[PDB]
């Protein structure tokens, strides 16, 4: 899942920045890493709201936590009102 990848990358940036600041590197690189962490979290919570959305293998954008809820294909208008049911057949109609 894409959220897996987003969490993976933000954790990567967190680890990199924490290890960099563990020793006290010069402030320019530290600030750049901090802003990259901010941007990574921004993309995580809503990939498409700010900036170019982060993609994955293809050119298609990934999906954030605020895209799996809203929209027609989210949760509300896709999974709670109508839930596909058992004991539910279908076939062709003929007049008798």
């Amino acid at each position: 899942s894409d959220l897996n990848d987003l969490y993976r990358r933000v954790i990567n940036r967190n680890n990199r920045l924490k290890r960099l600041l563990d020793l006290g590197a010069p402030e320019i690189i530290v600030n750049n890493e901090k802003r990259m962490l901010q941007e990574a979290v921004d993309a995580l919570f809503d990939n498409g709201r700010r900036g170019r959305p982060v993609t994955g293998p293809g050119n298609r954008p990934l999906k954030s936590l605020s895209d799996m809820l809203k929209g027609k294909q989210g949760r509300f208008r896709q999974n709670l009102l109508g839930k596909r049911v058992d004991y539910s057949a279908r076939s062709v109609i003929v007049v008798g």
Partner: protein, 192 residues
């Protein structure tokens, strides 16, 4: 470790852009997305208490600057008279005097231009120091360096998401709530 800001509330829909502090979204995206510093803290009471001493020290150091520039000016004068004398003694060509005077005048105007520039940035230090107010943005950085070295150990100013946390750690609500209510019934149009 590096603090971060939620995206829905800050930078999100304009209707709920924060507004706990009266700032534009542009201001928020300079302060948080790393363009310019802000002033997170101010000690105006101690500043006013010491204003006798602060102005006394400013006068002392500006007099020191002025006498340093006067020493530089007399150094310029001795250089100018020395080159005048030696090139008049030489007399190699009819254009050495005019060219050396052109160069000397270029040097003179450069010297006075940078003296004017340093007194002018000291005037910017003046106005920024008397208007030392929180929720203000400083685009340049070297001027901020000068300000914090000269006015050391008085206030706090920086970047950082937690820098806003400290702001929210200090900002009250009721007093300005009353103030904006007063401007709500004593005011004009879109101010309300």
């Amino acid at each position: 470790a590096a603090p971060v800001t939620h995206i829905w509330y800050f930078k999100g829909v304009p209707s709920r852009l924060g507004y706990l502090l009266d700032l534009a979204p542009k201001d928020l995206e300079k302060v948080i997305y790393f363009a310019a510093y802000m002033i997170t803290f101010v000690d105006e009471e101690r500043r006013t208490r010491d204003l006798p001493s602060l102005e006394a020290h400013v006068s002392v150091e500006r007099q020191q600057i002025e006498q340093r520039r006067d020493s530089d000016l007399e150094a310029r004068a001795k250089k100018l008279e020395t080159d005048l004398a030696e090139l008049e003694a030489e007399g190699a060509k009819a254009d050495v005097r005019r060219k050396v005077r052109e160069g000397a005048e270029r040097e003179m105007k450069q010297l006075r231009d940078r003296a004017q520039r340093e007194i002018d940035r000291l005037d910017e230090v003046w106005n920024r120091f008397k208007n030392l107010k929180v929720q203000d943005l400083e685009g340049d950085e070297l001027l901020y360096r000068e300000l914090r070295d000269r006015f050391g150990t008085y206030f706090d100013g920086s970047m950082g998401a937690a820098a806003l946390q400290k702001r929210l750690e200090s900002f009250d609500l009721d007093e300005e709530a009353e103030r904006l209510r007063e401007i709500i019934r004593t005011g004009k149009g879109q101010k309300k």
